[PDB]
Design an enzyme around this catalytic site. Structure first.
Site, PDB file in Angstrom:
ATOM      1  N   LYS A  46     -41.172   1.267   9.003  1.00 43.75           N
ATOM      2  CA  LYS A  46     -39.877   0.449   8.730  1.00 43.75           C
ATOM      3  C   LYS A  46     -38.772   0.820   9.837  1.00 43.75           C
ATOM      4  O   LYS A  46     -38.236  -0.196  10.442  1.00 43.75           O
ATOM      5  CB  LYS A  46     -39.159   0.550   7.346  1.00 43.75           C
ATOM      6  CG  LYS A  46     -38.326  -0.031   7.050  1.00 43.75           C
ATOM      7  CD  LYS A  46     -37.994   0.099   5.630  1.00 43.75           C
ATOM      8  CE  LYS A  46     -36.595  -0.702   4.938  1.00 43.75           C
ATOM      9  NZ  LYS A  46     -36.328  -0.228   3.501  1.00 43.75           N
ATOM     10  N   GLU A  63     -29.948  -3.499   0.412  1.00 43.60           N
ATOM     11  CA  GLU A  63     -30.407  -2.200  -0.506  1.00 43.60           C
ATOM     12  C   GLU A  63     -29.020  -1.946  -1.231  1.00 43.60           C
ATOM     13  O   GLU A  63     -29.168  -1.636  -2.311  1.00 43.60           O
ATOM     14  CB  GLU A  63     -31.043  -1.311   0.522  1.00 43.60           C
ATOM     15  CG  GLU A  63     -32.556  -1.378   0.519  1.00 43.60           C
ATOM     16  CD  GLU A  63     -33.256  -0.581   1.734  1.00 43.60           C
ATOM     17  OE1 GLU A  63     -32.552   0.231   2.034  1.00 43.60           O
ATOM     18  OE2 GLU A  63     -34.172  -0.926   2.125  1.00 43.60           O
ATOM     19  N   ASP A  96     -38.679  -3.477  -3.586  1.00 43.38           N
ATOM     20  CA  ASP A  96     -37.885  -2.576  -2.563  1.00 43.38           C
ATOM     21  C   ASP A  96     -39.148  -2.042  -1.449  1.00 43.38           C
ATOM     22  O   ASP A  96     -39.869  -1.299  -1.873  1.00 43.38           O
ATOM     23  CB  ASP A  96     -37.564  -1.644  -3.250  1.00 43.38           C
ATOM     24  CG  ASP A  96     -37.033  -0.063  -2.316  1.00 43.38           C
ATOM     25  OD1 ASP A  96     -36.613  -0.646  -1.377  1.00 43.38           O
ATOM     26  OD2 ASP A  96     -37.110   0.824  -2.855  1.00 43.38           O
ATOM     27  N   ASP A 146     -27.525   6.949  -0.570  1.00 46.99           N
ATOM     28  CA  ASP A 146     -28.922   6.711  -0.291  1.00 46.99           C
ATOM     29  C   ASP A 146     -29.597   7.772   0.303  1.00 46.99           C
ATOM     30  O   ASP A 146     -29.723   7.609   1.701  1.00 46.99           O
ATOM     31  CB  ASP A 146     -29.367   5.125   0.034  1.00 46.99           C
ATOM     32  CG  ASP A 146     -30.849   4.988  -0.036  1.00 46.99           C
ATOM     33  OD1 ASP A 146     -31.508   5.508   0.760  1.00 46.99           O
ATOM     34  OD2 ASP A 146     -31.176   4.079  -0.810  1.00 46.99           O
TER      35      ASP A 146
HETATM   36  N1  LIG Z   1     -37.628  14.124  -9.064  1.00 45.72           N
HETATM   37  C1  LIG Z   1     -37.449  14.472  -7.697  1.00 45.72           C
HETATM   38  N2  LIG Z   1     -36.993  15.624  -6.899  1.00 45.72           N
HETATM   39  C2  LIG Z   1     -36.810  15.729  -5.917  1.00 45.72           C
HETATM   40  N3  LIG Z   1     -37.218  14.613  -5.060  1.00 45.72           N
HETATM   41  C3  LIG Z   1     -37.875  13.620  -5.291  1.00 45.72           C
HETATM   42  C4  LIG Z   1     -38.121  13.425  -6.492  1.00 45.72           C
HETATM   43  N4  LIG Z   1     -38.612  12.121  -6.732  1.00 45.72           N
HETATM   44  C5  LIG Z   1     -38.790  11.767  -5.157  1.00 45.72           C
HETATM   45  N5  LIG Z   1     -38.351  12.627  -4.590  1.00 45.72           N
HETATM   46  C6  LIG Z   1     -38.305  12.670  -3.025  1.00 45.72           C
HETATM   47  O1  LIG Z   1     -37.692  11.711  -2.822  1.00 45.72           O
HETATM   48  C7  LIG Z   1     -38.202  10.666  -1.828  1.00 45.72           C
HETATM   49  C8  LIG Z   1     -38.518   9.362  -2.620  1.00 45.72           C
HETATM   50  O2  LIG Z   1     -37.865   8.381  -1.854  1.00 45.72           O
HETATM   51  P1  LIG Z   1     -38.068   6.816  -2.209  1.00 45.72           P
HETATM   52  O3  LIG Z   1     -37.161   7.033  -3.672  1.00 45.72           O
HETATM   53  O4  LIG Z   1     -39.143   6.339  -2.344  1.00 45.72           O
HETATM   54  O5  LIG Z   1     -36.795   6.139  -1.199  1.00 45.72           O
HETATM   55  P2  LIG Z   1     -37.399   5.194   0.049  1.00 45.72           P
HETATM   56  O6  LIG Z   1     -39.068   5.375  -0.240  1.00 45.72           O
HETATM   57  O7  LIG Z   1     -37.047   3.901  -0.115  1.00 45.72           O
HETATM   58  O8  LIG Z   1     -36.816   6.158   1.341  1.00 45.72           O
HETATM   59  C9  LIG Z   1     -39.786  11.123  -1.590  1.00 45.72           C
HETATM   60  O9  LIG Z   1     -39.546  11.885  -0.288  1.00 45.72           O
HETATM   61  C10 LIG Z   1     -39.873  12.417  -2.406  1.00 45.72           C
HETATM   62  O10 LIG Z   1     -40.376  13.584  -1.815  1.00 45.72           O
HETATM   63 MG   LIG Z   2     -34.548   3.493  -0.384  1.00 43.53          MG
END
Ligand SMILES: Nc1ncnc2c1ncn2[C@@H]1O[C@H](COP(=O)(O)OP(=O)(O)O)[C@@H](O)[C@H]1O
Ligand SMILES: [Mg+2]
Length: 376
Positions: A68, A169, A6, A191
């Protein structure tokens, strides 16, 4: 053997099928996700992942993030123009009209920067499987056009990977939630991630998915939750210490790191303390930052962003010609959907309890690992 990757706008994740059970791989730093951030030191080295994330505010020029939004896009794209206003790094126009980036003078392409991320992801996969990682299933947003998907396949092949397939996705998360074996249902994919919000409506007929509609905000993600808390913390620090942290980049860098960690703890705990010993050097003496923050205090600071994901969800249901009683199940993707208030909005938006079965920041990579094992 083929790994699923991913390549997210904020954090990337690699997974490989291990028999009938999926397996998320930990990188060299022990993390199950890798920040999609590349940086080049003043010494000249190249940083990928968390070593680059802990430097974004101190070295904003030679740090590339959220590229991205630039991949497979021309420089004259509206999305590139809006993203150009929100970044500290140089976004330059390519010779062929595409959008490129520059650091320390040298130019880089979005496919090239994305390859730097994928190099560490394959390096993470290699450290597990052993030998080398040749095949890979990479995911992309459903709204990616043809030119964007080829640029994503470019990034995988620049790192030395053979991109077998490039799925979507929202379809990837469906494979992670096991809906691949259902009969017939209409699904909504919520998402909310680090940099983008995506709402997708999918229909499964006899085992084949179909994208009905697509909406969301590409500039509404977890990064905005972080900065809002950072702006609040810096303000309540000028009202207590009389110092504006905006003048100390290292102090700010520390603050952003501490703000995001506070938000993450508040998803399973109603209160958390932020203790930053020896933050800034004042004329009177070395100042400190000790702050008590509650889940209720945070929900009110970021209630504006949570509400802003509601209109794109309803617009997706009229473009899909579905209602609340037509959507059979709602699944959550992106780490930001771990926030209980975001979960409450989703429940009050589709009339159903959201499916919290798969790690939302790992569901896309797990589904790509499902696709990999099948192509094997
Ligand atoms: N347990 C959690 N609680 C709240 N926010 C979170 C938690 N884990 C990650 N995050 C937040 O969510 C985002 C994670 O995004 P991610 O899963 O990497 O999706 P993508 O990178 O594909 O957009 C980060 O900005 C992080 O700050
Ligand atoms: Mg994502």
């Amino acid at each position: 053997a083929v790994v699923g990757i991913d390549l997210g706008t904020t954090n990337s994740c690699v997974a490989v099928m291990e028999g009938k059970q999926a397996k998320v791989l930990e990188n060299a730093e022990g993390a199950r996700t890798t920040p999609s951030v590349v940086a080049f030191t003043a010494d000249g080295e190249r940083l990928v992942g968390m070593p680059a994330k802990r430097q974004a505010v101190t070295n904003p020029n030679n740090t590339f993030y959220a590229t991205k939004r630039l991949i497979g896009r021309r420089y004259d794209d509206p999305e590139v123009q809006k993203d150009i206003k929100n970044v500290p790094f140089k976004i330059v126009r390519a010779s062929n009209g595409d959008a490129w980036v520059e650091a320390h003078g040298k130019l880089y392409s979005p496919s090239q920067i994305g390859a730097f991320v994928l190099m560490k992801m394959k390096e993470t996969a290699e450290n597990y499987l052993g030998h080398t990682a040749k095949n890979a299933v990479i995911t992309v947003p459903a709204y990616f056009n043809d030119s964007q998907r080829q640029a994503t396949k470019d990034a995988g092949q620049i790192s030395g990977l053979n991109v077998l397939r490039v799925i979507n996705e929202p379809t990837a998360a469906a494979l992670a939630y096991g809906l691949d074996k259902s009969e017939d249902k209409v699904i909504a994919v919520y998402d909310l991630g680090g940099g983008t919000f995506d709402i997708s409506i999918l229909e499964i007929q006899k085992g084949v998915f179909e994208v009905k509609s697509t909406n969301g905000d590409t500039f509404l993600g977890g990064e905005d939750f972080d900065q809002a808390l950072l702006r609040h913390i810096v303000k309540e620090f000028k009202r207590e210490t009389g110092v504006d942290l905006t003048k100390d980049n290292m102090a700010l860098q520390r603050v952003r790191e501490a703000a995001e960690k506070a938000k993450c703890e508040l998803s399973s705990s109603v209160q958390t303390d932020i203790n930053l010993p020896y933050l800034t050097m004042d004329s009177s003496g070395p100042k400190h930052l000790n702050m008590k923050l509650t889940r209720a205090q945070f929900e009110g600071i970021v209630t504006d962003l949570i509400r802003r994901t509601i209109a794109p969800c309803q617009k997706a249901m009229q473009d899909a010609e579905v209602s609340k009683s037509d959507i059979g199940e709602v699944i959550l993707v992106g780490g930001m959907t771990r926030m209980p208030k975001v979960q409450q909005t989703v429940q009050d938006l589709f009339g159903r309890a959201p499916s919290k079965a798969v790690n939302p920041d790992e569901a896309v990579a797990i589904g790509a690992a499902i696709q990999g094992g099948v192509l094997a």
